Write a protein that binds this ligand. Structure first.
Ligand SMILES: [O-][O-]
Ligand SMILES: [Fe+3]
Ligand SMILES: [Fe+3]
Ligand SMILES: [Fe+3]
Ligand SMILES: [Fe+3]
Lengths: 199, 198
């Protein structure tokens, strides 16, 4: 398969989420820094767990390097804007999606790779949603991250097909799409980069 | 920052080289795993010392280089039909981690000094092997020397942000003695940082 990001996601970022993000951009930016690092950390955990899946290892090693660069780019921007390293707790999103990962191998891996495609897919969509509302410096940076995010999305789907069956993958995608949109549109008590709508 | 030769207490023993040369498949696979654990350890430090800006910047870059090394070893493996055979971790790194004190900032000091030692030893050990390997592999290993030397220097420079000059020197004295004992003591497995046979 491997479709366009707009067709993969079940909904766009709500306007109510954007309004919350614009009114607390510093929290956003720090969380973002954190997301880029978690993505690298998760990538390395996949390599340790699936330590005989050669294509996954090579892809995850590269993805982690790329995510670290993102991490460093956000830090460089935080510095330029005088944004300190203050603690911001992990949002609910990723753990929410991981509750959908099946129990047994080899389908557990497939679901794990699909969730990664959704996280990347969502990030790309949300960066795109924000760009028009941000200042030039931050908007230009976010716009540049879109293409990496799409590349990461495609990478997870390609791994999925490599280790999974066409129809199983299509069903998984359908089920993760529903749970993801619920995490995105449901109320949330905090503002994170992948939070729901703050109430 | 002293030269790597002055930093280590001993060179790599002959019996280790002879064993390494006789099982280059285990050598390569374990080396690949060390590059991976070097990256993993760097991200772990970042998570742990997440407000130390110089530290996170240095470890972020270091992790990225280790992941290139990992990818490099894997490509060499594929070319030579060396499979992804699971290989258990050796004792060296956990042996050195026992030296780490429990309270900050000396915990971090000890941690960084240990990092410098691992890197310095890898640099010395690649060097000791180079003249005995096939051309391609030997030149690849020579090329990693410069990199490990920079990692060694980074760890040690960073350690100087957390302990005065005499305290870091004392830390280094103690870690050197321990590292040498790990390198020269009998070991049953062959691993990149394993000891000697029997
Ligand atoms: O950030 O993925
Ligand atoms: Fe990223
Ligand atoms: Fe990504
Ligand atoms: Fe390395
Ligand atoms: Fe290194």
């Amino acid at each position: 398969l491997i479709p366009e990001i707009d067709a993969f996601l079940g909904c766009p970022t709500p306007d109510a989420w954007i309004e919350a993000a614009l009114a607390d951009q510093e929290t956003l930016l720090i969380d973002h820094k954190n997301c880029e690092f978690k993505a690298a950390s998760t990538a390395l955990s996949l390599i340790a767990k699936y330590n005989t899946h050669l294509d996954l290892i090579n892809m995850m090693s590269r993805l982690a390097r790329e995510e670290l660069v993102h991490h460093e780019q956000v830090l460089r921007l935080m510095k330029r804007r005088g944004v300190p390293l203050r603690p911001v707790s992990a949002g609910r999103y990723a753990s929410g999606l991981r509750r959908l990962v099946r129990a047994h191998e080899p389908v557990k891996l497939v679901d794990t790779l699909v969730v990664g495609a959704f996280i990347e897919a969502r990030s790309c969509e949300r960066f795109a949603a924000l760009v028009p509302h941000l200042d030039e410096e931050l908007g230009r940076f976010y716009h540049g991250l879109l293409k990496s995010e799409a590349r990461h999305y495609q990478g997870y789907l390609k791994l999925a097909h490599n280790y999974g069956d066409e129809a199983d993958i299509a069903r998984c995608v359908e089920l993760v799409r529903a749970a993801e949109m619920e995490l995105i549109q449901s109320p949330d008590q905090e503002l994170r980069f992948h939070s729901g709508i703050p109430q």
